[PDB]
């Protein structure tokens, strides 16, 4: 099982007082004149409980409380009384269990399980409590258990499954008896103990405000794109703006922009009428979609429009603006085409003359103020940018940090994220060059941003553990054995775990770090297999290598 | 500066039908929901009929029957098919939609004009 539980072998607070209640709560008391008779849960101090002379109310209610001695009411040294107090989705849940004792001013060791004793479906916040009348008091933390059921169904043992190795290896074989043998139980990974941060120096931000709060804004047919690059892109001056019709992103979360970076950036501007902005979408058709400005099925960017009455209308209303509605073609995406030529609808040429058979392939607005919204201007921009990872020259807004060396650290350059342990190096880069890559194109070397010096990238190490046991049925003494790494980088229950984490028996094979054996000089026939020429056994008594 | 509009109002007899149409022009980007809200002469507004971005249909309870509310599958068009109507259906109706301001689309909530609906 894997639940809630009291932790083997663990400090429980004695007294003999406001107390938390951080997500169970194992209360033990023993006494033999009954001094102790309730408790009281909630916040600001909400529940009760309490057993006068016979009779044990369990109330809800808000109170008055130094204490001694309405949503529901369900009113109606030789001892040891055990209770597990815990709160779960709206239910209150205590279990409990009685026994008789013959012992002073300490917890007898022994094992004895924890019949449910009562659900209540309060649903109230708890943080802290306090008893009403020597008490024992603990906590839980979620945990991994393996439990034996005998043939009634009760619980007689079991075993915490985090202790120890010899513990963790009788989970992986679900036993409570382990053969002689060596047995593979787990990983081992170093982790992270920084972040890194390194972006260029360069502080001019990109020039938003010239395309947005711009003068006069391009015809459709005929589309103005900027491009923009070597600046810092700040977003927050979009994001305070709230006079936006559309803002709608598609291949990236519009909320994060101020986190990635970018290779190309472009900027698309235009007015459109406001019945044909549904038009500006991937897959969709129309004469805009198909004659004047045709987006891609795999787009990557944001498309922002508002609205511009006040801003492009004449007093009978402006006809500057000017769109394609004859074309003998349809157009691939981000095609421009701003020909001139009468098209010719009949079968004689038009030879530049309109008229029959021949219309011009143009028409223009008119932008009457008074019209309905359906009509008005709308001024409309198109960001379009790539997104790979590689040198990423537009970059957010962001703050570099120092360097480090040697250490299993997060770094982050010019969006090159990654995790590692970076080195000088000996590689001879070309000035071009920003990074190299192994066989199976993985990168393993950059250069810094702001020095242009070569790190090299190795990962973190990591590798099994082994646990060495003679038999169960002759000792409880392990061995460990860290497979492929160094003895330095080995660094959990620290009396039970750290044990094996330092000591004077470390061991370095060929095949590992091996912690707990001892190293003689002599020769034996193999007993257990460790690897590359060496066996372990347990002989005169502890274990051998 | 307005982002939102009512139309389709008019005067027709008891009895009569008439059609509406709320047309705000980002609104399948948006993905918001809608709301026709009414005020008659000598009261307070009172919720009219609701849509969501899945269809689930609300009608007020005078209304259903005859008022139908749908949205056209694209130029971002809604419609309140009135009939079966009734002198006391002459009020102002109004509108109400979400825009986007940091990031997500439907955080600013937006009332409309409003349209005359005088039955006779």
């Known amino acids: 099982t894997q639940d809630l539980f009291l932790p083997f072998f663990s400090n429980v607070t004695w007294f003999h007082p406001v107390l938390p209640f951080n997500d169970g709560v194992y209360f033990a008391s023993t006494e033999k004149s009954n001094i102790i008779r309730g408790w009281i849960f909630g916040t600001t101090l909400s529940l009760l409980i309490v057993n006068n002379a016979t009779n044990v109310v369990i109330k809800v209610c808000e109170f008055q409380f130094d204490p001694f001695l309405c949503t529901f009411e369900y009113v109606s040294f030789k001892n040891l009384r055990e209770f597990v107090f815990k709160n779960i989705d709206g239910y209150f849940k205590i279990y409990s269990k009685h026994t008789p004792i013959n012992l002073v001013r300490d917890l007898p060791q022994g094992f004895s399980a924890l019949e449910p004793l009562v659900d209540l479906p309060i649903g109230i916040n708890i943080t802290r409590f306090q008893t009403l009348l020597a008490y024992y008091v603990g906590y839980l933390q979620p945990r991994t258990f393996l439990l034996k059921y005998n043939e009634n169904g009760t619980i007689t043992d079991a075993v915490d499954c985090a202790l120890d190795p010899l513990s963790e290896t009788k989970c992986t074989l679900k036993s409570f008896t382990v053969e002689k043998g060596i047995y593979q139980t787990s990983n081992f990974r170093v982790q992270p103990t920084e972040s890194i941060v390194r972006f260029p120096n360069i502080t001019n931000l990109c020039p938003f405000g010239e395309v947005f709060n711009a003068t006069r804004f391009a015809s459709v047919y005929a589309w103005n794109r900027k491009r923009i690059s070597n600046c810092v892109a700040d977003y927050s001056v979009l994001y305070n703006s709230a006079s936006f019709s559309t803002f709608k992103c598609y291949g990236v979360s519009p909320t994060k922009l101020n986190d990635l970076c970018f290779t190309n950036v472009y900027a698309d501007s235009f007015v459109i009428r406001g019945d044909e902005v549904r038009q500006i979408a991937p897959g969709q058709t129309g004469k805009i979609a198909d004659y004047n400005y045709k987006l891609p099925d795999d787009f990557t960017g944001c498309v922002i429009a508002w609205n511009s009455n006040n801003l492009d209308s004449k007093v009978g209303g402006n006809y500057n603006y000017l769109y394609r509605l004859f074309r003998k073609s349809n157009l691939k995406p981000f095609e421009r085409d701003i020909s001139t030529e009468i098209y010719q609808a009949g079968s004689t040429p038009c030879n530049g003359v309109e008229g029959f058979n021949c219309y011009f392939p143009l028409q223009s607005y008119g932008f009457q103020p008074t019209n309905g919204v359906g009509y008005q201007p709308y001024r409309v921009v198109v960001l379009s940018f790539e997104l790979l990872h590689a040198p990423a020259t537009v970059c957010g807004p962001k703050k570099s940090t120092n360097l480090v060396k040697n250490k299993c650290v997060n770094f982050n350059f010019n969006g090159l994220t990654g995790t590692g342990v970076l080195t000088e190096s000996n590689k001879k880069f070309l000035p071009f060059q920003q990074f190299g890559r192994d066989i199976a194109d993985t990168t393993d070397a950059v250069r810094d941003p702001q020095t242009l010096e070569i790190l090299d990238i190795t990962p973190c190490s990591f590798g099994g553990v082994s646990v060495i046991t003679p038999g169960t049925n002759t000792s409880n003494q392990v061995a460990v054995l860290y497979q492929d790494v160094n003895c330095t980088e080995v660094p959990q229950l620290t009396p039970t775990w750290r044990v094996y984490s330092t000591g004077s028996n470390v061991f370095q094979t060929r095949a590992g770090c091996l912690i707990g054996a001892e190293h003689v000089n002599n020769s034996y026939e193999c007993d257990i297999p460790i690897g590359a020429g060496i066996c372990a056994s347990y002989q005169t008594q502890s274990i051998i290598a | 500066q307005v982002k939102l509009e009512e139309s389709g109002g008019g005067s027709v007899q008891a009895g009569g039908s008439l059609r509406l149409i709320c047309t705000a022009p980002?609104?399948?980007?948006?993905?918001?929901?809608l709301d026709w809200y009414r005020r008659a002469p000598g009261k307070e507004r009172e919720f009219v009929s609701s849509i969501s971005a899945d269809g689930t249909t609300s009608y007020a309870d005078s209304v259903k029957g005859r008022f139908t509310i749908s949205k056209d599958k694209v130029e971002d068009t809604v419609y309140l098919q009135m009939n079966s109507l009734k002198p006391e259906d002459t009020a102002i109706y109004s509108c109400?939609?979400?825009?986007?301001?940091?990031?997500?689309?439907?955080?600013?909530?937006?009332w409309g004009q409003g349209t005359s609906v005088t039955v006779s």
């Open positions: 109400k939609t979400a825009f986007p301001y940091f990031g997500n689309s439907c955080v600013l909530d937006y």
């Open positions: 980002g609104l399948t980007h948006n993905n918001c929901g």
